[PDB]
């Protein structure tokens, strides 16, 4: 194994990863930072984000409104000490993004425009057309080029981290093109690998979002926080699960059933609003969960239109007209045209709720540090205590820049204070990695990886849905256990070394199953209904602050068991009632 020295190593070149990269280079110019990514930095899932990044900008706004909004939308599972900090650095970070060249859509007076997302009463969502992610990531990536300090490792698959004596000391990654292993020594390491949306059968996520980092963290004693909370997006294309931005419904789009009935009024979100002026919290703009839940019910009544792609409801956008559509909905216009064959001005688009955002992730303090000194998690793969039981729409992209920076800065200090570990046990850890790999290559059995995949995705959908019942959560837990077993009987047929994807996809599948197990186990153990977690069984249908105002922590022991702990929820100035 070729060895590389670094002051700190970032795993993941997404938005948060890059934001940490830059942060680190500005905080110490003489640093050797290793930016490591299994794809090129501008391929990261972040680029597909369309809605926008949230930050207090309007005169009549207040950070306390942003705060309230988060904690309330988070159903009081937020770390209020963390939320407070987060809101306070949103404008700073959004402004700075503008400063580096992000082309935010502007008011005619040439200042940044903002729109409403995630139900926030006051609109504080900064946006660039509907390619906000694309601009943010590209801005961040293109920015990162001007720091000599950042050494990039593109198309490098991170296999494991190195740890001894409660401290991270490096990592081991494959050079994907060459097929050889590498070891980067760093006294502090940032996990920015994004979430695990890809463990569901239907989801809005890019193929690369497979939970790797989380899985890695699992292998070292680090728990995953609040993995039961998984957010579906009310409106996704059938089949692909391709996201149609809420912006559709903000501009006045309507959701109808097989009788062209606007059904949402019949579910507590009525009285039907006129086609012209939609209203926040009413009808199509009702709260997220209620809109998805309503789909389920409508399907129960047999009111869904049935396509070969699946049972769907209609998102009607015709009444918007040509001009209104191309100014704000051009991307949504081309997607629907391409992937379902629908001109949104000519006819309605099929939609159905789809798996979207992983609220859960790697446990971290207010400083993004995990229980392993020098090891950090940030962004979708992490849990800083920001989102609680439900993330506010547009707070995620905001989080990348806000905490990305914090992480880059915090990791800089741990790398400076490190002192040395024991190189023998460290080089042994690496021998360990290398060996576990040869273990997976040589493994025989003739189980097809793609079927264990196909089947995990299925169990996730059927067991961990909008609505959840003990019977199904159990069947999923069970199913996962077999698949975990079957996984050990998988044969990687492709033995080549130049860009072996058969191998890579298989490793990510490994991680999926560990993570999947943590959602499923967490979900079942939560005998209550909170946020994205909705149980139908008796005495679990409502919010329980008496017994369940606590985060779920899921650990994975060497024996392969998924074990749960609970921890308290820091509250400052906003106790529930």
């Amino acid at each position: 194994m070729q060895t590389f020295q670094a002051d700190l190593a970032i795993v993941g070149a997404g938005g948060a990863g890059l934001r940490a990269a830059i942060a680190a280079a500005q905080a110490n110019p003489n640093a050797k930072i290793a930016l490591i990514s299994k794809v090129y930095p501008m391929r990261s899932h972040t680029v597909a984000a369309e809605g926008g990044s949230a930050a207090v900008a309007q005169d009549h706004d207040s950070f306390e409104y942003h705060f309230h909004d988060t904690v309330a939308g988070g159903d009081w599972l937020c770390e209020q000490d963390v939320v407070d900090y987060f809101v306070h650095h949103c404008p700073t970070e959004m402004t700075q993004l503008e400063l580096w060249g992000c082309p935010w859509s502007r008011r005619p007076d040439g200042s940044v425009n903002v729109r409403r997302f995630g139900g926030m009463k006051i609109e504080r969502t900064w946006f660039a057309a509907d390619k906000t992610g694309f601009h943010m990531l590209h801005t961040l990536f293109q920015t990162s080029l001007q720091f000599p300090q950042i050494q990039r490792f593109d198309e490098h698959f991170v296999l494991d981290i190195l740890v001894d004596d409660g401290h991270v000391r490096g990592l081991v990654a494959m050079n994907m093109m060459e097929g050889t292993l590498v070891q980067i020594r760093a006294n502090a390491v940032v996990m920015a690998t994004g979430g695990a949306g890809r463990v569901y059968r239907y989801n809005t996520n890019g193929g690369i979002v497979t939970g790797d980092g989380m899985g890695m963290a699992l292998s070292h004693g680090v728990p995953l926080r609040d993995m039961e909370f998984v957010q579906y997006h009310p409106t996704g294309l059938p089949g692909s699960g391709i996201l149609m931005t809420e912006g559709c419904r903000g501009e006045g789009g309507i959701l109808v059933n097989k009788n062209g009935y606007r059904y949402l009024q019949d579910y507590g979100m009525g009285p039907e609003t006129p086609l012209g002026e939609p209203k926040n919290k009413y009808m199509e703009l009702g709260p997220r969960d209620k809109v998805s839940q309503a789909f389920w019910h409508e399907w129960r009544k047999g009111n869904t239109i049935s396509t070969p792609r699946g049972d769907v409801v209609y998102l009607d956008l015709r009444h918007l007209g040509e001009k209104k559509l191309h100014e704000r909905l051009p991307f949504i216009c081309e997607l629907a045209k391409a992937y379902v064959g629908v001109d949104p001005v000519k006819e309605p688009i099929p939609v159905r709720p789809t798996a979207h955002y992983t609220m859960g992730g790697i446990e971290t303090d207010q400083n993004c540090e995990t229980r392993i000194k020098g090891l950090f998690a940030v962004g979708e793969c992490s849990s800083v205590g920001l989102h609680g039981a439900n993330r506010l729409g547009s707070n995620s992209l905001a989080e990348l820049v806000v905490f990305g920076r914090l992480a880059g800065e915090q990791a800089t200090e741990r790398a400076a204070t490190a002192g040395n570990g024991n190189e023998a046990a460290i080089e042994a850890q690496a021998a360990g990695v290398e060996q576990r790999l040869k273990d997976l290559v040589n493994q025989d059995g003739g189980e097809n990886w793609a079927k264990i995949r196909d089947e995990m995705g299925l169990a996730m959908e059927e067991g961990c849905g909008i609505y959840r019942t003990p019977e199904l959560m159990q069947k999923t837990i069970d199913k996962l256990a077999e698949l975990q077993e079957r996984f050990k009987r998988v044969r990687i047929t492709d033995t080549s070394s130049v860009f072996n994807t058969d191998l890579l996809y298989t490793i990510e599948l490994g991680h999926g199953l560990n993570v999947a197990e943590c959602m499923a186990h967490s979900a079942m153990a939560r005998k209550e209904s909170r946020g994205a977690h909705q149980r139908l069984d008796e005495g679990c249908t409502e919010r329980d602050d008496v017994n369940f105002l606590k985060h779920t922590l899921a650990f994975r022991d060497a024996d392969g068991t998924t074990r749960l702990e609970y921890s308290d929820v820091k509250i400052t100035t906003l106790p529930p009632a």
Binding site: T95, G101, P103, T143, I242, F499
Partner: protein
Amino acid sequence: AEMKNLKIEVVRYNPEVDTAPHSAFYEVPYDATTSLLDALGYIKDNLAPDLSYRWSCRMAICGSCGMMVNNVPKLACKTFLRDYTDGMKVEALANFPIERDLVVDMTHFIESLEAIKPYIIGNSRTADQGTNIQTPAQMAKYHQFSGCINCGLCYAACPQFGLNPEFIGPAAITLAHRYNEDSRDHGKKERMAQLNSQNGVWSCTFVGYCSEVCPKHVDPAAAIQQGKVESSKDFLIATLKPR
């Protein structure tokens, strides 16, 4: 019901075993909605599990998709089988060295992008002072050019790049032009050299095929032209500077 099948030719190449890329054929089931990326995946899961390719977004936004299809630079995730009933040949992105299967060395492209300093330059403004002012009119100047997904189709398209691998190429130029035309940036001088080189804008004979294939409708050809004009302005100033 019963799904129709399609005989899809895919040019395989393994550097360890093969001396040259060789065709391979795969029956894929499809319907109206099936993309090539979908097809590729079916092959990997079912037929040839050593079939390596790049993808991610599945919605023509990340840019990792790019390959040749019946000799046209296209995006797997946006190419639909329903259109290729009469035979479909799939090849690695043209004008790039094939590394393995549908996976090409994108290096020159990366270094190219990097060389034009694609980032705001010489703006001393700081975050506490709030954001720069920029009108929709000012944005309109560079906006369209800011939508490149670094897919690289426009390079497989470009016969000048094909004949001069040292030509920084349509994307790179476009991306530079975007920053030069950003009202917020003052690093034009820092970018001209690269654009002014023979390998810069001056390698473009305006075939204009770049803009034709560009899945993101960026019209890089137009930026290269606009860059030709700027290089000439720049040439004159520097001829008339005796200073």
